[PDB]
């Protein structure tokens, strides 16, 4: 084993991207050792769909996709197939037949500056519901009424709102970092396996 | 997009911006009440002004959506609460006049001082100077001096301000399409659009008066018994058939007869249950008190306090340099932040207050899932009623013995039960005629049924007739004795204390039945009963989302306020009072006065 999959960057990045513009990293052509994942952070909401976690070292996939972002405590449960809300509807939606794992852990220490960590935004309004595995980084003013908007107004709203993360909040409002691993095997031989 | 859909999106934008701005104002207000500095006063004002300006802007924007075109009632409730004009319906000149009158009356009340004769320097404020006199002094003349001087030197300053206050408040209420300012206040109990649960503003007057007629027999025997005991202490001051002198009632106004307990105690040789010595014997601290309170709510199926509660609250006096406002309060800053501010001492009173205040926290955590505009009690009397029933169970000997503060060998006889019920009636029953008569006077003043040249004349005719209390000094129309109370000169509705009192015994009687309690209602402890906790939580989580008549029905099974549980609580005393008054005159003559 000489080429370990670079999980040292996904679970230990200096800062994570906003949920509406969640970051996607591709992991391939490497040996995947998930046993070290528990050493990265005290995982709170580890959950795998379509695959038993204890057998993660005994499977192979063509490519792995890590989608990393930051949400609130209440919105962690929205990261699941067939779920609805704000994050699952207008920010980041998983397919109904999703296969992979979800790892969510608290980051109250790194994403709470006591004055409002307003660098993490989420999409509040959208014309339609987000398609699975789609990013909508568009920043056009949202129209709620019938009049033209061409900018902010009484019924013309900015689609993105900034989280007000602070360390004084409860566990339900403290920021949580989420990494969703999706496993894919289309045609190519699996370049990702276990030890 | 329809108007209702635009309002749902408008309320969606409002909730997220309000929760942030409300948290900034609540945190800045917390840092002042826990660290009274000059920098914290400005930061509290700056954050409070930004929150007040945000509401005024959103109220105008909310008034651009016609309520008639909204059919979803949960959306209409949030729009209706946000569209409430209030003082913003008057002209800018009249609203500026009204806010100046309100600030002056609050300043006159909080700064009004009375100086003893022959020393223009030895002056006393209401708190603590005059209040200490009205609560501890047994001297007739000393209490008469404090009672009269507070009303002739501070109340007379409020008389001209209160006349213009009624005019502008009536113009404000009538511009909001209300009959008068009293009808405006009664809108807190109004319910429309819900078949079988509606409630009109005028119905509150009829229900308060109807239930008060059933309280009269209990109060007359409590009044007669108190008069007899006080007549033995002041034989030359009290008539056996007249009303009670207003300055001999336990406080500045007779709002509570609690302090009359020393002179009216039935069996003055059996001591009260005071587990304060036991708490010090067991090295209890403030954290132990709140931990025991936390265990209480957990025993009935309610959640434990959040980690941020134990970390952010101030459960002890900061002491030394850092000063703080030691009044016990429960804080719901929002966004999962719940705190309790309290300079807790190792006493039995603070032990029961901790259960009273943590009950407010349980209420807040329950409806925290509701929208921002629906996070409150069902009406103005719900929140305080939930806190009262917690100290009811926590103070019983059954509960005090189950936690190791009261000795198991300590037995309770019917003489200590009467002493407890009499102490309770002096505070609970003694305040109901005071509260109803005061609020009825303001209802009639706002309605225009009492002319200005007969304000004080009608005020004391109703004190003699309804409350059975006579003024010791004749007062002309230069006085303003109602304004000598905080709530009247600071513009607060008062009927909330009448409805809350009847609510809490409805709650307690219902929860104790769910707890399968046997025996008198006053000995009940709902501890370890998850069934009672489930029945209470079914109303706490509602918040303001449902009509208060429906929220009340989830606990007690009835849609309206009921006085029978209150009478069921005091029945062992009522039968004892009637036996004590067999050779005494029950009732009062309104023509007798101590200055006749
Ligand atoms: C209270 O205010 C004083 C005045 O600046 C400050 O020195 C102190 O640290 C403050 N205490 C807290 C707990 O904020
Ligand atoms: C009213 O609107 C809320 C969202 O604002 C929705 O959850 C609820 O189901 C609606 N109720 C009815 C009866 O349409
Ligand atoms: C608010 O006041 C305006 C006039 O200032 C009035 O037309 C409107 O009906 C009022 N609305 C409410 C909800 O009080
Ligand atoms: C409440 O009690 C449960 C155990 O019943 C515990 O797991 C939880 O951490 C407690 N909550 C807090 C805030 O301590
Ligand atoms: C409640 O249960 C606890 C044990 O769970 C017990 O110690 C306590 O005495 C009980 N109290 C009552 C009033 O039943
Ligand atoms: C208390 O009960 C005893 C009998 O158990 C009775 O003789 C006495 O009169 C009662 N006293 C009161 C005040 O009820």
mmCIF file of N, CA and C and ligand atoms in Angstrom, chain B residues 267 414-415 418 576, ligand 6:
data_model
loop_
_atom_site.group_PDB
_atom_site.id
_atom_site.type_symbol
_atom_site.label_atom_id
_atom_site.label_comp_id
_atom_site.label_asym_id
_atom_site.label_seq_id
_atom_site.Cartn_x
_atom_site.Cartn_y
_atom_site.Cartn_z
ATOM 1 N N UNK B 267 -53.450 28.958 64.222
ATOM 2 C CA UNK B 267 -52.795 28.206 65.290
ATOM 3 C C UNK B 267 -51.340 28.663 65.340
ATOM 4 N N UNK B 414 -54.339 18.586 60.680
ATOM 5 C CA UNK B 414 -55.252 19.543 60.070
ATOM 6 C C UNK B 414 -55.057 20.966 60.575
ATOM 7 N N UNK B 415 -54.295 21.167 61.652
ATOM 8 C CA UNK B 415 -54.011 22.525 62.101
ATOM 9 C C UNK B 415 -52.942 23.186 61.238
ATOM 10 N N UNK B 418 -54.614 24.111 57.819
ATOM 11 C CA UNK B 418 -55.356 25.368 57.846
ATOM 12 C C UNK B 418 -54.398 26.552 57.861
ATOM 13 N N UNK B 576 -63.590 25.779 57.351
ATOM 14 C CA UNK B 576 -63.059 26.200 58.643
ATOM 15 C C UNK B 576 -63.359 27.670 58.909
HETATM 16 C C1 LIG C 6 -58.698 18.333 63.411
HETATM 17 O O1 LIG C 6 -59.154 16.979 63.528
HETATM 18 C C2 LIG C 6 -59.538 16.603 64.861
HETATM 19 C C3 LIG C 6 -59.900 15.136 64.813
HETATM 20 O O2 LIG C 6 -58.954 14.390 64.060
HETATM 21 C C4 LIG C 6 -60.687 17.486 65.336
HETATM 22 O O3 LIG C 6 -61.010 17.153 66.681
HETATM 23 C C5 LIG C 6 -60.295 18.955 65.242
HETATM 24 O O4 LIG C 6 -61.408 19.779 65.574
HETATM 25 C C6 LIG C 6 -59.815 19.289 63.832
HETATM 26 N N1 LIG C 6 -59.375 20.674 63.756
HETATM 27 C C7 LIG C 6 -59.517 21.426 62.661
HETATM 28 C C8 LIG C 6 -59.007 22.832 62.758
HETATM 29 O O5 LIG C 6 -60.034 20.992 61.635
#
